[PDB]
Amino acid sequence: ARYLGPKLKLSRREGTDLFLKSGVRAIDTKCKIEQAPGQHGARKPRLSDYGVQLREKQKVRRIYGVLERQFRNYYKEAARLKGNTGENLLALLEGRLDNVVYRMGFGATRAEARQLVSHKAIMVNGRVVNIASYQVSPNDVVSIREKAKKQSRVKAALELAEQREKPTWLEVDAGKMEGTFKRKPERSDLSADINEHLIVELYSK
Amino acid sequence: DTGAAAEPRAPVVTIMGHVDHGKTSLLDYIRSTKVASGEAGGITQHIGAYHVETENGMITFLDTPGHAAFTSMRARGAQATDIVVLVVAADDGVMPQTIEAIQHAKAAQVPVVVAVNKIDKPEADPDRVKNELSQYGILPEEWGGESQFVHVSAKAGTGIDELLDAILLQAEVLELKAVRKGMASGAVIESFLDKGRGPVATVLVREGTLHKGDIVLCGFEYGRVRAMRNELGQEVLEAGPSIPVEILGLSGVPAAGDEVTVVRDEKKAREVALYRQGKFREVKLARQQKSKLENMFANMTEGEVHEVNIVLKADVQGSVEAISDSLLKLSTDEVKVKIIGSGVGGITETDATLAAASNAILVGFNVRADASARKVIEAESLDLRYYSVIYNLIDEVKAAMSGMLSPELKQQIIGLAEVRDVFKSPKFGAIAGCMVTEGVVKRHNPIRVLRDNVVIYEGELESLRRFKDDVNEVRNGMECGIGVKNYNDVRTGDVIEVFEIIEIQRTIA
Amino acid sequence: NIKSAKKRAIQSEKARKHNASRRSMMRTFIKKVYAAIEAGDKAAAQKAFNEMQPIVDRQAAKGLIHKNKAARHKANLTAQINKLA
Amino acid sequence: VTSYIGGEGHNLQEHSVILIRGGRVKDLPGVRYHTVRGALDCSGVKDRKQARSKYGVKRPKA
RNA sequence: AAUUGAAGAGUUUGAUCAUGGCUCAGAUUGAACGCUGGCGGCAGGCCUAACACAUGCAAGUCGAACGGUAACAGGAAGAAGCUUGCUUCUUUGCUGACGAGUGGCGGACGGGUGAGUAAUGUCUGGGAAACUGCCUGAUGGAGGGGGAUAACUACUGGAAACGGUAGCUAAUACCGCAUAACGUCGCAAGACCAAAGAGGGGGACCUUCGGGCCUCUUGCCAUCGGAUGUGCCCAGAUGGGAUUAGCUAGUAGGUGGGGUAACGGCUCACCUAGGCGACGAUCCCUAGCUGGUCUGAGAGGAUGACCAGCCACACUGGAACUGAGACACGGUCCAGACUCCUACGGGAGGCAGCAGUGGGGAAUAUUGCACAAUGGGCGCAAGCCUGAUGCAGCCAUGCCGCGUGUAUGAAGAAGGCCUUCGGGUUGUAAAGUACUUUCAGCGGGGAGGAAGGGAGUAAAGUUAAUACCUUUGCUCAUUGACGUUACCCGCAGAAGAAGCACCGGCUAACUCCGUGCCAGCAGCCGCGGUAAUACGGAGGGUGCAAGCGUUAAUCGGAAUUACUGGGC
Numbered sequence A: 001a002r003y004l005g006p007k008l009k010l011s012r013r014e015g016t017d018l019f020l021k022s023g024v025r026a027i028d029t030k031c032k033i034e035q036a037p038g039q040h041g042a043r044k045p046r047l048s049d050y051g052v053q054l055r056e057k058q059k060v061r062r063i064y065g066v067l068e069r070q071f072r073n074y075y076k077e078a079a080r081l082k083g084n085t086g087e088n089l090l091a092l093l094e095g096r097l098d099n100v101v102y103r104m105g106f107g108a109t110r111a112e113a114r115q116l117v118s119h120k121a122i123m124v125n126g127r128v129v130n131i132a133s134y135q136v137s138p139n140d141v142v143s144i145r146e147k148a149k150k151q152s153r154v155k156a157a158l159e160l161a162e163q164r165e166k167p168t169w170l171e172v173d174a175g176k177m178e179g180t181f182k183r184k185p186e187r188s189d190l191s192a193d194i195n196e197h198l199i200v201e202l203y204s205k
Numbered sequence B: 001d002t003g004a005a006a007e008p009r010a011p012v013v014t015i016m017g018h019v020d021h022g023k024t025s026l027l028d029y030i031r032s033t034k035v036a037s038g039e040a041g042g043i044t045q046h047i048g049a050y051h052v053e054t055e056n057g058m059i060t061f062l063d064t065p066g067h068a069a070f071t072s073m074r075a076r077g078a079q080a081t082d083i084v085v086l087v088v089a090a091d092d093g094v095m096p097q098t099i100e101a102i103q104h105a106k107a108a109q110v111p112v113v114v115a116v117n118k119i120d121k122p123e124a125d126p127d128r129v130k131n132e133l134s135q136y137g138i139l140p141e142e143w144g145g146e147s148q149f150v151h152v153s154a155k156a157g158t159g160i161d162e163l164l165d166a167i168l169l170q171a172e173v174l175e176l177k178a179v180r181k182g183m184a185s186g187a188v189i190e191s192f193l194d195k196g197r198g199p200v201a202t203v204l205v206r207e208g209t210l211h212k213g214d215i216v217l218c219g220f221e222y223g224r225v226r227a228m229r230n231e232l233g234q235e236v237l238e239a240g241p242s243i244p245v246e247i248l249g250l251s252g253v254p255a256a257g258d259e260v261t262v263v264r265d266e267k268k269a270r271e272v273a274l275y276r277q278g279k280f281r282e283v284k285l286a287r288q289q290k291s292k293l294e295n296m297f298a299n300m301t302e303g304e305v306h307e308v309n310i311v312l313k314a315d316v317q318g319s320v321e322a323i324s325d326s327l328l329k330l331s332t333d334e335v336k337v338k339i340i341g342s343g344v345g346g347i348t349e350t351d352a353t354l355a356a357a358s359n360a361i362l363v364g365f366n367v368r369a370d371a372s373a374r375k376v377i378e379a380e381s382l383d384l385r386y387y388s389v390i391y392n393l394i395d396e397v398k399a400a401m402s403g404m405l406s407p408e409l410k411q412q413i414i415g416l417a418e419v420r421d422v423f424k425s426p427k428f429g430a431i432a433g434c435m436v437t438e439g440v441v442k443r444h445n446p447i448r449v450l451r452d453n454v455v456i457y458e459g460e461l462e463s464l465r466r467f468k469d470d471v472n473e474v475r476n477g478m479e480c481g482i483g484v485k486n487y488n489d490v491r492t493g494d495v496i497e498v499f500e501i502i503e504i505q506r507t508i509a
Numbered sequence C: 001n002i003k004s005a006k007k008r009a010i011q012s013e014k015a016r017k018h019n020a021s022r023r024s025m026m027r028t029f030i031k032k033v034y035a036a037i038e039a040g041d042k043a044a045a046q047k048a049f050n051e052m053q054p055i056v057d058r059q060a061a062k063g064l065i066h067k068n069k070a071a072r073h074k075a076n077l078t079a080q081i082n083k084l085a
Numbered sequence D: 001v002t003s004y005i006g007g008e009g010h011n012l013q014e015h016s017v018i019l020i021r022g023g024r025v026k027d028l029p030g031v032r033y034h035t036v037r038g039a040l041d042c043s044g045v046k047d048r049k050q051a052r053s054k055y056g057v058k059r060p061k062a
Numbered sequence E: 001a002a003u004u005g006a007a008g009a010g011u012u013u014g015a016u017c018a019u020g021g022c023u024c025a026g027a028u029u030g031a032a033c034g035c036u037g038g039c040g041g042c043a044g045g046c047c048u049a050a051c052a053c054a055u056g057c058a059a060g061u062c063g064a065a066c067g068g069u070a071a072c073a074g075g076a077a078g079a080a081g082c083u084u085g086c087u088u089c090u091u092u093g094c095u096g097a098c099g100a101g102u103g104g105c106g107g108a109c110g111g112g113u114g115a116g117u118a119a120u121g122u123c124u125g126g127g128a129a130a131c132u133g134c135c136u137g138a139u140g141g142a143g144g145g146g147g148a149u150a151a152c153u154a155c156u157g158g159a160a161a162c163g164g165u166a167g168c169u170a171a172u173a174c175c176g177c178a179u180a181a182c183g184u185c186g187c188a189a190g191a192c193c194a195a196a197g198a199g200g201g202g203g204a205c206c207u208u209c210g211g212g213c214c215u216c217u218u219g220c221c222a223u224c225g226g227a228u229g230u231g232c233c234c235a236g237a238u239g240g241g242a243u244u245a246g247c248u249a250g251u252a253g254g255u256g257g258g259g260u261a262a263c264g265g266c267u268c269a270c271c272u273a274g275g276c277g278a279c280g281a282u283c284c285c286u287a288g289c290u291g292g293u294c295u296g297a298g299a300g301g302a303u304g305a306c307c308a309g310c311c312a313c314a315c316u317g318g319a320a321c322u323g324a325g326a327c328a329c330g331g332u333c334c335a336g337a338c339u340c341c342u343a344c345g346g347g348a349g350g351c352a353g354c355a356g357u358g359g360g361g362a363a364u365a366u367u368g369c370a371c372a373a374u375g376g377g378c379g380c381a382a383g384c385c386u387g388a389u390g391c392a393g394c395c396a397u398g399c400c401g402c403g404u405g406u407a408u409g410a411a412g413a414a415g416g417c418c419u420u421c422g423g424g425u426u427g428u429a430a431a432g433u434a435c436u437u438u439c440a441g442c443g444g445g446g447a448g449g450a451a452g453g454g455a456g457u458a459a460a461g462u463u464a465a466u467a468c469c470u471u472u473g474c475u476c477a478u479u480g481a482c483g484u485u486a487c488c489c490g491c492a493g494a495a496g497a498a499g500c501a502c503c504g505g506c507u508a509a510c511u512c513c514g515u516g517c518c519a520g521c522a523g524c525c526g527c528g529g530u531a532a533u534a535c536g537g538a539g540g541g542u543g544c545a546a547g548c549g550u551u552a553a554u555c556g557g558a559a560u561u562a563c564u565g566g567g568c
């Protein structure tokens, strides 16, 4: 239940930086981003009204690395949950364990964050968690265990994690190599360029 | 198959010959059974293995009937057995079926011991058998060819003591190799289909080991064994490399014979079994494309296109492959016969449907009609015939074929007449006055109109009329009259030849 | 199939043969009651009524007549004998 | 009932009972069905590479 | 805080707008087929032949009802081969137990099936005219006798199944007598009806020295209640067809008699001529119904697998018995069809129980393990039995989680494909370099499902009694089918693991080559007759993932049956 192919093709086909190539370097410079999506990608960017609805869903799925069947449950869960359906969609995705591991700066990329979580090196409230789709709630503390601590994979991630946005909704800490989820992320703190109204539309028909 | 453990085993023995050397009698007397002539046909048309307990040690017996039809059974029975026995009669001597059994002994490199069947009849002498079979390298006696002859009554029940001893010794002189525990493997004697029990097979196990939980794989068929049956015994817990045990619980009826190997897990053996099906299916479509394309033309070059179809389902798997080969022997260029949908047993809906599409006879070596089968057969017009023996079957199929033929070999003239002084008629356009010089002219019999030895016109008479009488028959040297449709020009001097048409009929051979 | 309650079959046969004799006698005492009701005998009807009274109540206590079937005989047959009497 | 044979060429004729998937495509008047390829006795399409699921073509060893 | 949610597109024409059908995007399934395929968890798994079946098992259990030794386990006694410590082989029910037999209770539960049944059905809401084992509450009896019988012996009919005749024997089997209201039958007076012992132990007056008796537990009998089940009645709702409009003699009602546990044409005799029906009787066709399931914004529509309630059915047809309850799945008989055994006279058998087979069909399973647990049956209990159940096996059938790497990496390599031959694209992809070892494989450790029950003790209860027994503590042994369990730790190395449809528009995703109304595609409108983004292959791409398609099925779209919500 993972992609495994080229991460930049997913970035190229969208025409937006997914932060999958980040790791050590950043801001692309060398790219070939957009411009030839396929072999005949140099053809004009004119596209259907239906296609841009699907194109938004693919952006959100290719960022977080989620499959359509697993992602079908998050719309179904976000719709039944109260308030705005679009705001609940990204809120449930933002509460994934792989992503919370990525936001605190343990993994240098989102796939690498799912990679480390799979190996049972991440522990919520003391207890270990294998599943990357583990839903993180308020007052949950998540940290790397004693085995495989202070490795160059996790150490280099936390070094360059300070250069990013540094999210307010969770404490970076990184002193004892741990983290804490303070509260549920706001609408202003995420989204912006990725729209929720476009992805929420696609499921209605 | 590890540890290299070597344990002695009971020798498996097969017996061959010309039909009638009382080959069966030898077994039944030892078995103290006498099932002979208790079954339809009076002879053994099936194969079975029976183990008996007699001093010294243990021994089992296997038997296959010798006939032109069973090419495969005698071939497989030879290679499976460690020792082969050839029955021979002083009255019968050597016969072309017996020499056929000679080849199976040498080609399978199996040592052979033989027995003289009749010491009872005064016209029977051993010296005749020894000398006449001397010419063949097989069966030397005291010439330094290590082969030993036995003289038994087979009716008298006379020893035997010698034959038994030779068999034990012949198995004793050669090293007996087997193992009590290990990976089980072996060959299949005969397979058939049962209604309650399900698909079953009679299996000789080379390495002797078994268990209800062990997974067994026979050919392209796989499955877990539900139960085990040995001869009369309904249930056996364990089975050794010596004694044969009927296997049960396999997915479907396997091949008439093949190598069987048990496996640890069934899941690992599923892909292997399906793999063998793919190859057997690929060659099936391969042989299908060749035979159709072989003619290299859209039809047959001649008139043999008329053929007969048959549908066969036999209870036993061993027969359908074996007798079909003999069923293809009776095939001829004129009438071609082919088998369609050979079954493992009984009868079924799709089988009766198979005979419904193309007209065919539905026959079985041994079968009973299912409740759903009777409804279809009774409704549409069909034929259900079951035959206890293969000989009564091989004769009637030929009979079906012989009848199919429609030959008329006679075109002899009925009468010859010359026409003179043509008359005009409104209906036929002409009436040619005639005078019959020879024979009798008839109405519906065809005629050949010829002038100057070449045939100007041909046809069949429509109206034969003399005067206003319009008689259907006119003799020779009696004034006669004739007219026919589609004949424009009547000229004097020509002669009309009328001839009757008869069919000789045909026979197959 | 040789199975479990073939012992109960011969017991139910013995119980049938037992109860069939006791139900038959019970009714033949009731048969003598209407012999006097069909006739004009008041004394013989009450005589046969007091003969059936012990036996019929004894069947309900045994548990074969089933309580009210026994009581219904005496209920109706009390009403029958005193129409003319 | 009449049935359409998909793919280029076939070995089907006379005997050998075949599977029928169904579904209607309109071209030869009266056809309401389609035959299954690579099922029971029916051969799949030879030398085909794209669309192997349709027409019973197996994956070649690469 | 809780049924808070409504999409359209394509196609009539030269073109347009209505009207209007067809078609597609969605979800769903007890699925199948085609191709492919790593693991785990949970659930699902003969939808057709209510077609028929091999074999084992699916209900037995009480010696604390009773006569008993048929088994082997001891103990005891005796006789022997002898080693001086033992085996060996006949006796003895002394005993732990228990074949068969009599008796008690359960075989009416559990499990299966969807053939019938369009209403002796079901769902919903009421009613009165009933019974109801085991289990509980209340007030009293459990006195005294008799005649039989299976088992087992003596014979005999049989091939087998299964008997016959004559003896003998116990009981919680059976039948009289006595006992008799609060019960039954009556206005009343009255009449009338019941039973059974067994086991624990024990001081005292005591035995024909069995045990009375006292006491404990258990069971029987009778009546009045409770609970539970079940019977029965009424109303409404619960399919299609008017190309079925008339249908009914026990039919509708009464009286009397009989009948049922109980009201009743329930069943008879007689009397009267009614009864049902356009608000669809009757007939015909199809069907178990419901909680729900699926779809839908809702209203509705379709549907009745699994789970649970009710009903019917148990090879077909019909009937009765036993019993509290059955008009009886593995019970009885009779008839029909079918199969097996046979000495040919005669018997035995019913997988729509769990597995499994023939056969049907596109297609759906292991002839498994355990009573460890849960709920039943019996018993005082141990404990026995339990294909119910709990588990495992099998299949991707469905649903859900996870893996098949991660980071770095331009030479934007090689090769493929295209190219106006400048280059682009596959492509950070690969290789290379640096990291990690989940799930698998291998080696270790190790929860929970497990409370009881058993054997000794301590005290308080019962009691004439510190017997006994019940309850409550304590301590000592234990009882896991699943189970190489779940889970945790270590070892080795990117090692063992990605395919399928599709890319003309609808509809996300394009060029070349080959073929040339040929071969084929296609859901709809349509492509191909020599520049095919529509076929076939290739490169590239998109969707989706141990799944992906096709097909079939129902709803949605369909405001195209429109009550909500349309026209004439």
Ligand SMILES: Nc1nc2c(ncn2[C@@H]2O[C@H](COP(=O)(O)OP(=O)(O)NP(=O)(O)O)[C@@H](O)[C@H]2O)c(=O)[nH]1
Binding pocket: B017, B018, B019, B020, B021, B022, B023, B024, B025, B026, B036, B042, B043, B044, B045, B064, B065, B066, B067, B117, B118, B119, B120, B121, B152, B153, B154, B155, B156
């Ligand atoms: N005189 C005599 N006749 C014998 C003797 N042994 C057998 N037979 C005859 O052989 C006959 C039995 O033959 P059988 O064994 O059935 O032959 P078979 O083995 O079936 N032949 P095949 O193998 O070809 O099928 C009997 O009828 C008997 O008369 C014997 O010793 N003496």
